[PDB]
Amino acid sequence: YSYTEKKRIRKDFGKRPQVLDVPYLLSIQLDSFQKFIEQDPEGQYGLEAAFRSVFPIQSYSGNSELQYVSYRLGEPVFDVQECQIRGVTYSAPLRVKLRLVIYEREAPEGTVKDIKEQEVYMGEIPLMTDNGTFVINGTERVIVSQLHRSPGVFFDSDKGKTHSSGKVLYNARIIPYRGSWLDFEFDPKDNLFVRIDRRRKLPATIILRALNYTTEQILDLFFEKVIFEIRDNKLQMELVPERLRGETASFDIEANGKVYVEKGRRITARHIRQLEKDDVKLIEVPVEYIAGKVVAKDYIDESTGELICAANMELSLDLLAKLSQSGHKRIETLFTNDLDHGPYISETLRVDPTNDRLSALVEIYRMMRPGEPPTREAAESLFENLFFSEDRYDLSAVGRMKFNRSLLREEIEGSGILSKDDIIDVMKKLIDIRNGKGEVDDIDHLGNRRIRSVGEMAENQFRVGLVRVERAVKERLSLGDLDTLMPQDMINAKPISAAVKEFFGSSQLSQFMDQNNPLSEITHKRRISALGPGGLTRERAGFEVRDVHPTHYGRVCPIETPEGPNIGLINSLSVYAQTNEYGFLETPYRKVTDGVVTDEIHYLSAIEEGNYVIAQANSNLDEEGHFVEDLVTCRSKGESSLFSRDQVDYMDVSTQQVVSVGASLIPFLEHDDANRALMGANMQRQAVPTLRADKPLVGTGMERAVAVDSGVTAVAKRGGVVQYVDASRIVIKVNEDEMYPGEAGIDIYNLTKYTRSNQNTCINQMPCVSLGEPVERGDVLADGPSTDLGELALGQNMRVAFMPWNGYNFEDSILVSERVVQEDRFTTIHIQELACVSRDTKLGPEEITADIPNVGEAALSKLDESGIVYIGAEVTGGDILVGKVTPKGETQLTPEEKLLRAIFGEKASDVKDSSLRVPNGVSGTVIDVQVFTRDGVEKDKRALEIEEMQLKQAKKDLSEELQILEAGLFSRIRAVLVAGGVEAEKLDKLPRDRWLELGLTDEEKQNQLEQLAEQYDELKHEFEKKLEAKRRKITQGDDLAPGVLKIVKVYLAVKRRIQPGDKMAGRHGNKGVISKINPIEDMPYDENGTPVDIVLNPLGVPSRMNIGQILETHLGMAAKGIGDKINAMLKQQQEVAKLREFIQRAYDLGADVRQKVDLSTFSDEEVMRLAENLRKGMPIATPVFDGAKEAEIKELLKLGDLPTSGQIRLYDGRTGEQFERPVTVGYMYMLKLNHLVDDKMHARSTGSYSLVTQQPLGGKAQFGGQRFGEMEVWALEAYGAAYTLQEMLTVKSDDVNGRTKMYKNIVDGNHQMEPGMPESFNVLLKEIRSLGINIELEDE
Amino acid sequence: ETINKLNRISRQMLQEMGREPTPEELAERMLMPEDKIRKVLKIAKEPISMET
Ligand SMILES: Fc1ccc(-c2n[nH]cc2-c2ccc(NCCN3CCNCC3)c(C(F)(F)F)c2)cc1
């Protein structure tokens, strides 16, 4: 048990003990990047490997070589927070040692001079936070793990759809990590074909010739030998007795003076056995049987030196005679069978256009680069460079592994390039598949599916950078003078830096972390994608790959995937899942040895798991843990059934391991249909944090893990006592056993305060601990947004009643009491970042000055002298945050305006008002302001006020650091001096600064005093340098874009509570949009007179089958019951005994549950606090499939004083009369998603317009109008409304004349239209006429 | 040609200065009034395809 658990304990139903507890949920993200940037003294993946690949770069024969020595990553320029404020990227400089050697010309190899250029800088590579996030521009970002076809070889079918003759087809595909694809495929004529990439089809054998195999060796490779002897005269044959299987006698089969088979009798196992036991090696055959036989090798006349027959040719009765008289004793033929061993390769040769290696290479080179004249060196170079070059081709480790394994080889590791043996063996396996032995794999199987992560992808993009730098290095080493240039002048920065910057900045897999929510973060960071580079597209791959595979078990969550255009192309990572050593997916299991279930954990990959019979997470074992029944539900290969008692090899670790963290947070999930569960876990991530993090009343027991693992909270590094608790920071005094000897210590935690999240919500940490409190190591020191006391609260639980209320709940609609909007619980704090840009126009520079043409004193009031709004001033729509004015001279007015000016004597300014003002309708308070200035431009008044302020605050903070730290150290010196020379009152008298002189008796304690001395001084100077650095960082001008002189960013905090039109939802996939906000007066209430917060619609429950939301209600009610009781017993102030008794009773609850409990806990001070927290309601945990049962819920309702039905009497708050029938009332945990209506709402009358084609377009974030499409037009066409349509597509939109001539009539009170011609068609006319086409408008 | 020289200076001073030279750095390295960098540095840029 822990210390914050003594504060609050969640009551846990469920039986199954957890043999393994949930690991770090962020494991994948951090591990990957941990592998990428790291020093590995070998070829294992990392910057080292990608370096060793392309390097060393040598010139072309010129013997000028550039070799790579070692690299390093410099300390980050700005740390995370600073990088977030300013908007730069959090990255490290990459400094790599390059050694330039020049070989003496006409060597034995030795170097004239080798200049070692010390660490030339190439690029700045981004860094991953402790939370697995990257900051690109002032913004946290996540790189999604990728799921693709693993490198290796693969065998597929494509039966059915091709050709509609059936017969299937069989294909092999060699997919390397890098390099061209190698494809083999059959056809309806059983001719084997090969194609490189997706390119032109070539007869298979044509590649073999390029490996230097004559026809004879191809035949010798793919077929066996049928021996023919002419001995004495007329035709014997060698007979392997198995050859006659699946065939019928063509003649009398007889040898050894005994006739085994007669013509017309199919040769069966009997005949074959007779031949085998009588051992017939040689039989006599007719000269006519070789009429169809295919000769193996070449045959020439020994005398005339002429070719009798070429290899692979069909013999004839005459050809036999022609080669027999030449003195040929033996003839080798192919062993061919249309059932067992197929004659494919032979016909493949029959379609082969080539003869010799060079010819094949010609056809290949003319295939890959067609139309241009082929050359010998060209064909050779290309073909050798395709699959055989260390440069252009790699399957790497996973590739070679899966390759060799799928080829049934021994070696698990080998070369990254193909060999003749490789290609040949692949062809062999394909031919074997067509022959009937062996099966085709499937793409969806997770054994053929591989997971990449941030590290690998970043490695690849950096690899591209390194190759594009390689070309440059070789390009320069060409003409180079000797000792002048060094490994700087060649190697650039921008190519590499942009190679990585392009990746992290914009990529389909790199995105802005979804942080509105601790669940959203952690569920984004565990994610898979089959999209992007190396993957498929939504438009390409169909249902199969998307569909849930049996191999998804324990690895990919079945129920959490997006609902949109890409379904199952994302999924999510399962709870207990892990990335395999080779990069596959493996899931925890429990080993069953003999008849016992062992608690030893075992990790099995998708293929590892295949043959084993695995037991169930939910099964009954007891005592020694032997299976209670004689047969139990299990799953062995791809399916599930009842399995014998001792058969099963393994068992599921937990009940949750099938799902993900999102699904594992849904209570009573087993009772919900999969569609609504999907929708539920999909929406649970959209929950905006509330103002008061509440807690789920109805839980799971995962929420704690999500809260802690996600970095939103603040977790103790080391256990100790709290010295100080501020809303700003938290200072903990470390225990000695956990404490390092030197630098004494205290752990100081600087809490994140109100700041802008990625979703424009607020992220703010609050302290959960008090002054002088015991804290265990690994305990929550502070709550993040939407986290309560170390658990995950994504929303708030409330009293809910299921019953139709005056149709205000009509579809999914939600009817909420005024009690809720008053309590401000569902209220949310949004943090927006607004910016003002001072640019340079040819008319002049723009001023941030507070002097603005045409504004009242009320407008210039909220701004200081410099033109920026004061921190803390509450603003609304139209208020000026930053005064900005840009020059535009000579307005060039008109006559009447000139008259007006003549009468009113006003000087029309040469300056225009560009000032940044709060967007219309939004309102809030200003929590911060930043000013970025071009380095060298004079900082205005405001920016200087701010700079001085920040300097002072910096000095104050650093000084605080050094002070608490120093006191912390001297407090330890005081304690060590007291051993061996203790003087109590004597020591604390003299000045503390003079303490270091005092020594001790001979012992190690003197050396400890030494340690504290050293570290003390270290801290003392480190303070100095830190203050210096901070000051310089504050004062330095931030680098800005072209033309921008300065930038002012204002940070607003808006508070929006709740209003009709907002979206709210439970965890069960039940949506709703709040309809009306109803007075507490009109609210349904019970006999006790307590109104219900929310009134739902029962009709929503039966159709969409989610019954969990009802269970969740019931138990929820019961939970609150346990609270209310306690809430009375505390308000009764009974005593420790009564409370303790009742709480214990609650935590026990009938029989058979795994929770355990108290009175190991302090009877007074600890218990009363527990009850104190419980009084809101009693938090309950419902494990995913292990969850609570009806009887348990009713039993807990009995303890609650509340009915079993879960329904009570309710009265209409209006008439006061009772509602007929009982209605269900309970507590349902509810989330406010951020769809909030003051975001969604838009309206436009006359806005800006697009330049290219004149059409309505928002330029101000004053929205463009709605898009009227084809279907809407049709809908207008069905109705007889012509004028509505015409005005829709002419005057209201596209007509440049029509819109204004309209507006004037609209204000004049005349409703008409003088339409003219739409500008789209007008432009199209020109576009058509811009060609050789004349398009005219006729007649009149 | 001016733009090209401006590129050369960048290439040398980039790893030499450890990050990149300040916008005014190559300015003194170049013979002319040296604020011109910005001006030049602007006009050098090719217009982005409107179809991007
Ligand atoms: F985890 C479980 C639980 C139950 C079953 C199960 N129990 N009984 C039958 C099935 C069953 C059979 C097939 C499929 N899908 C197609 C997979 N085949 C194998 C090769 N690739 C294509 C075809 C499924 C599932 F999960 F996909 F829907 C379940 C399976 C796994």
Cβ–ligand 1 distance for A552 under 6 Å, the answer no
The answer to whether A686 and A1233 have CB atoms below 8 angstroms apart is yes
Q: Give the whole-angstrom CA distance, residue A1015 versus residue A64.
A: 50
The span from the CA of A1125 to the CA of A1146, in Å, is 11
Helix and strand numbers, DSSP H then E, in chain B:
3, 0
Centre of ligand 1 from the C-alpha of residue A631, in Å: 21
DSSP conformation letters of A208-244: HHHTS--HHHHHHHHS-EEEEE--SSS-EEE--GGGG
| Cross-strand partners of A175 | A152
A contacts of B41 (beta carbons < 8 Å): 1042
* C-alpha of residue A658 to centroid of ligand 1, in Å: 14
CA gap A730, A735 in Å, rounded: 16
Helix spans in A1036-1153 (H): 1100-1103, 1108-1131, 1136-1148
In angstroms, the CA A301 to CA A312 distance is 17
Contacts of A492 in chain B (CB under 8 A): 11, 14
Give the dihedral sign, CA A1143/A1144/A1147/A1149. Answer: negative
- Return the CATH superfamily for domain A827-937+1038-1056: RNA polymerase II, Rpb2 subunit, wall domain (2.40.50.150)
What's the one-letter identity of residue A17?
A: P
Q: Which of A124, A935, A1042 sits opposite B41 (nearest CB)?
A: A1042
* Helix pair A454-476, A47-54: axis angle to 10 deg: 30
User: How far is the alpha carbon of B37 from chain A, nearest alpha carbon, in Å?
Assistant: 11
- Closest ligand 1 atom to residue A444 Cα is 21
Residues A1184 and A671 sit within 8 Å (Cβ to Cβ): no
CA A373 to chain centre: 48
Q: Kindly report the three-state secondary structure assignment for every residue of A747-798.
A: EEEECCCCEECCCCEEECCEECCCCCCEECCCCEEEECCCEECCEECCCEEE
| Ligand 1 binding pocket includes A381 (Cβ within 6 Å) | no
A54 token code pair? 């392309």
Cβ-based burial of A33 (10 A; exposed 0-12, middle 13-18, buried ≥19): buried
CB contact under 8 A, A492 and B41: no
The alpha carbon of A548 and the centre of ligand 1 are apart by a number of angstroms equal to 8
Fold of A938-1037: Helix Hairpins (6.10.140)
Nearest to B22 among A77, A935, A1042 (CB): A935
Q: Is A440 in the pocket of ligand 1 (CB under 6 A)?
A: no
Helix (H) or strand (E) run with residue A675 in it: helix A674-683
What phi and psi values does residue A5 have, to the nearest 5 degrees? -80, -25
- How far, in Å, CA of A648 to CA of A613, rounded? 5
Strands A787-788, A774-775: parallel, antiparallel or unpaired by DSSP?
unpaired
Beta carbons of A557 and A571 less than 8 angstroms apart: yes
Find which of B6, B14, B36 to mutate to test the A interface (most A CBs within 10 Å of its CB). B14
Return the residue of B nearest to A485 by Cα.
B12
> Cis (ω within 30 of 0) for the bond into A56?
yes
Q: What is the CATH number of domain A574-654?
A: 2.30.150.10
- CB contact (8 A) between residue B12 and residue A492: no
Q: Provide the 10 A C-beta neighbour count for residue A647.
A: 13
Amino acid at residue number A1240: K
Residue A650: strand pairing partners? A591, A614
Q: Rounded CA gap, A124 and A500, in Å?
A: 8
Q: How was this structure determined?
A: X-ray
Q: How far apart are CA A223 and CA A345, in angstroms?
A: 8
Q: Where are the beta strands (DSSP E) in A914-981?
A: 916-917, 924-933
Indicate which residue's Cα is closest to atom 9 of ligand 1: A639
Residue among A180, A168, A167, A176 nearest A207 (CA):
A180
Q: Which CATH superfamily is domain A151-223+342-442 in?
A: RNA polymerase Rpb2, domain 2 (3.90.1110.10)
The closest residue, in CA terms, to atom 12 on ligand 1 is: A639
User: Quick one: which H or E segment has residue A593?
Assistant: strand A585-593
CB nearest A121 (choices: B18, B24, B42):
B18
Residue A222 Cα, gap to closest chain B Cα (Å): 54
Contact A809, A1223 (CB under 8 A): no
* Cα A154 to ligand 1 centre (Å): 21
CB atoms within 10 A of CB B33: 9
Point out the residue among B15, B19, B22 whose CB comes nearest to the CB of A120: B15
How close is the nearest chain A Cα to the Cα of B1, in Å?
19
Q: Which letter, b or e, does each residue of A572-590 get, where b requires 16 or more Cβ atoms within 10 Å of its Cβ?
A: bbbbbbbbbebbbbbbbbb
Burial of A1102 (0-12, 13-18, 19+ CB in 10 A): exposed
How far apart CA A330 and CA A295 sit, in angstroms, is: 11
For chain A, the residues whose C-beta falls within 8 A of a C-beta of chain B are: 77, 93, 120-122, 124, 488-489, 491-494, 935-936, 1039, 1042-1043, 1252
Q: Which helix (H) or strand (E) holds A196?
A: strand A193-196
Cα separation, A851 vs A326, in Å, equals: 114
Identify all chain A residues contacting B12, using CB atoms and an 8 Å cutoff.
488-489
The Cα–Cα gap between A607 and A611 comes to: 8
What is the architecture, at CATH level 2, of domain A712-786? Beta Barrel (2.40)
Residue B4, C-beta contacts closer than 8 angstroms, at least 6 positions apart: none
> Which CATH homologous superfamily contains domain A655-711+787-826+1057-1240?
DNA-directed RNA polymerase, subunit 2, domain 6 (2.40.270.10)
Q: What amino acid is encoded at A1010 in this protein?
A: E
Which site among B9, B15, B42 would you substitute to test the A interface, given the most A Cβ atoms closer than 10 Å to its Cβ?
B15
**B8 close contact with A: CB closer than 8 A:** no
Nearest CA to ligand 1 atom 30: A639
- CA-to-CA distance for A14 and A782, rounded, in angstroms? 30
- Please list, in sequence order, all residues whose beta carbon lies within 8 angstroms of the beta carbon of residue A451, skipping any fewer than 6 positions away: A145, A146, A147, A528, A579, A583, A584, A585
What is each CA distance from A898 to A585, A817, A895, A901, in whole angstroms?
78, 60, 5, 5
Residue recorded with tokens 């309950």: A1180
Is the beta carbon of A832 within 6 A of some atom in ligand 1? no
Task: Give me A1004's structure tokens.
Answer: 């190690």
Residue A553, ligand 1, Cβ within 6 A = yes
Task: Test A122 with B24 for CB contact under 8 angstroms.
Answer: no
> Cβ(A545) to ligand 1 under 6 A?
no
DSSP state of A922: -
Chain A: closest CA distance from residue B47 (Å): 14
| Distances in whole angstroms, Cα of residue A430 to Cα of each of A338, A441, A794 | 16, 12, 54
B24/A contact by beta carbon, under 8 A: yes
Distance A552 CA to ligand 1 centre (A): 10
Are A1062 and A686 in contact, with CB atoms under 8 Å apart? no
CA-nearest residue for atom 22, ligand 1, is A442
Contact B42, A1043 (CB under 8 A): yes
Residue pair A1235/A1062 in contact by the 8 Å Cβ criterion: yes
- A571 CA distance to ligand 1 centroid (A)? 17
* Residue carrying the six token digits 């317009």: A1249
Whose Cα sits closest to atom 5 in ligand 1? A639
A1327, containing H or E segment = helix A1319-1329
**Spatial separation of the C-alpha atoms in residues A753 and A1035, rounded to whole Å:** 23
Closest Cβ opposite residue B42 in set A121, A936, A1042: A1042
- Long-range pairs for A417-422 at CB < 8 Å and ≥24 separation? A417/A387, A417/A388, A417/A389, A417/A390, A417/A393, A418/A174, A418/A182, A418/A387, A418/A388, A418/A393, A420/A211
The structure tokens listed for A16 are: 């199954």
Question: Which residues partner with A93 through β-bridges?
Answer: A124
Q: Which CATH class is domain B1-52?
A: mainly alpha
